[PDB]
Structures are given as structure tokens and as C-alpha cells.
């Protein structure tokens with residue numbers, strides 16, 4: 001009847017504005033605050049831009065196609081709305097690929113990539129993403145009916161002409177969803193597994209606020225770490241303490257030797273006794289009331305915490321939070337776009353087995369994915 005139409009228009013209207021509000025609020029928080037324009041947060045701007053377009057146009061136009069059950073906007077308004085919807089969502093999956101590429105190279109190759117992530121290279125990746133999405137859809141939707149010589153799409157309805165064949169649509173489905181999802185699936189596991197994955201060499205790197213050095217600097221750094229341990233073994237007051245410590249707290253001991261020298265570390269008599277006597281809680285308070293905690297508090301606070309917990313929980317707080325963001329992003333993407341692509345996968349091997357009702361619900365389900373992304377920004381960061 002029409003009673004369900006009213007309810008349909010209310011629910012679809014609610015999701016339209018809340019997507020827009022969420023996206024606009026993100027952009028304002030990017031243009032105002034100069035502390036949110038980072039490398040990874042710059043890619044979240046392109047996502048907020050693409051999702052905003054869908055919320056203001058695609059969400060508003062596709063609703064009328066369901067309500068009136070007919071397209072009454074013309075032929076020039078049809079091919080444009082499809083181009084807008086397909087380019088923005090294609091730039092969207094390109095943005096997600098760039099986001100997933102940044103974290104994968106920052107973990108796998110932290111020596112020759114972490115110091116290469118600039119704003120210049122970030123602006124190009126986004127710029128190219130929007131251009132590539134344009135070349136693949138705009139001519140294929142606008143200038144395909146002319147190459148044929150006629151418009152296959154009948155008046156009153158609206159759909160892409162070159163995607164009439166289920167075979168082509170399926171091929172489009174794989175390269176565009178199945179292939180990026182499987183890639184981002186492999187990347188995410190590589191990032192989540194290589195979380196720790198944490199040695200002394202990188203431990204010092206953080207405390208120094210240090211950066212990735214050359215290939216030769218790694219040869220010298222290893223010799224310095226190896227020679228530091230030899231000095232601890234030579235030391236008659238450090239050797240018994242160092243030997244009783246585990247591989248995690250051993251490195252934390254070298255952290256102080258690298259800083260204050262072997263002799264300076266040997267000063268903490270009461271602390272070293274507590275470390276050998278497995279009294280971690282008492283040594284943490286003890287090391288926090290020295291001159292070392294007052295000279296370099298942030299460096300000490302991470303070393304002291306390493307002693308207390310016995311884990312690398314003081315050097316992964318920024319990296320684990322970076323994985324929680326991507327986890328919330330790809331989860332919403334594979335839970336919404338999948339039921340549509342499942343149908344595309346199925347529709348390829350049959351004729352009439354998937355109702356237009358399910359194609360509509362499968363279509364609208366992907367729209368709300370653009371709404372979760374602004375929420376994931378306030379749910380993680």
C-alpha cells in the first residue's frame with residue numbers, strides 16, 4: 001500500500017542526513033584543527049568526501065526510484081547519477097587500498113618507507129584515485145549508448161547499459177570487490193600478526209624519537225648493541241642482574257646502558273637488587289624517584305613500564321590503535337557490500353532467481369557503509 005511507503009521514506013530519509021552530518025562534521029574537523037591533517041588522516045578526508053556525495057545525491061535519488069517505482073528525471077539525469085554513484089564508490093575502494101598500503105609498508109619495511117610518507121605523496125594518491133575512477137566509469141556510462149547506436153535502457157527505468165550482461169557485471173564485481181577485499185584481507189592479517197614483532201633496536205629508536213637510518217647505520221647499530229651487552233657481562237654488578245632477566249626486560253636494561261653508560265646503571269643498587277629478586281612493583285616506584293626519571297621522563301616512563309609489566313606494552317600503544325581503526329573500516333565494508341556482490345556472483349549463473357526487491361536492499365545496504373566510516377572515526381581515534 002502507501003502506509004509502508006511512508007515508513008520507507010522516513011527510514012531512508014533518516015539515514016541520508018545522518019550520513020551527511022557525519023561527513024560534514026569530519027571535514028570541518030579537518031579544516032579547522034591543524035592537528036588532524038596527518039598522512040593517514042588525509043586519506044580519511046577523501047573517504048569523507050566520497051561518502052558525503054553519496055549521502056546528498058545517491059541516497060536522495062535512488063529513494064525516488066523505489067518510491068515512485070519509476071525514473072522520472074530524464075535521460076541526462078540518469079547517466080549522470082550512475083556516474084556519480086560509481087566513481088565516488090570506486091574512489092572509495094581506492095582510498096581503502098591506499099590506507100591499507102600505508103600500514104603494510106610501515107610494518108614490513110619500516111626502514112625505507114616510514115621516512116618517505118609525506119603530504120606530497122598523499123595528495124597524489126588521492127588525486128590519481130579520483131581520476132582513475134573517472135576514466136573507468138564516466139565514458140562507460142555516458143558515452144556507451146552512442147557507440148552502440150541506441151539506448152537499450154527503456155524509459156521509466158534506470159540502469160547501466162554496458163553492465164546488461166551478467167558475465168561482464170561479474171567480471172566487474174571481482175576486480176572491484178573480490179580482488180580488493182582478498183588483498184586487504186591478506187594485508188590486515190600481516191599487520192595484526194606483525195604487531196610484536198618488537199626488538200631492542202626499534203625500542204631505542206622510539207625513545208630517541210629516532211628515524212629509520214641507512215643500510216650502513218644498521219651495521220653500526222648492531223655492533224653497538226652487541227658491544228653494550230659485552231660490557232654488561234664484563235660488569236660484575238650488571239652480569240648477575242642481566243642474566244636473571246627475561247628477553248624483554250634484558251633489552252630494557254640495555255636501554256639504560258645505552259643512555260647512562262655501564263657505570264651509571266650500576267648506581268641503582270636497590271633497583272638492581274629488586275630486579276634480580278623478581279620484585280618488579282617495588283623497583284618501578286624506586287626507579288621513578290631518581291634523577292633519571294626527572295631528566296628524561298617520557299623515555300623512563302616507557303622503560304619503567306617495560307620493567308613492571310614485562311611486555312612491550314609501552315611501545316605499541318600508537319601502532320595497535322592504528323590497527324583498530326582499519327579493523328573497523330574493513331569490517332563495515334565486507335558486511336555491507338558483500339550481500340550485493342553475493343547476488344552478482346549468483347545472478348551470473350542463472351536467469352530469474354533474484355527478485356528486484358533483493359537488488360534494492362542489496363543496493364541500499366552498501367549506502368549505509370558510507371555512514372559507519374564517520375562513526376568509526378569517533379569510535380577508535
Ligand SMILES: C[N+]1(C)[C@@H]2C[C@@H](OC(=O)[C@H](CO)c3ccccc3)C[C@H]1[C@@H]1O[C@@H]12
Nearest residue numbers: 085086089090172173176177341363366
Ligand atoms: C552504490 N552501490 C550499491 C552500487 C553497487 C555495488 O558495487 C558493486 O558491487 C560493483 C562491483 O561488484 C561496483 C560498482 C561500482 C564500483 C565498484 C564496484 C555497491 C555500490 C557501488 O556503486 C555501486
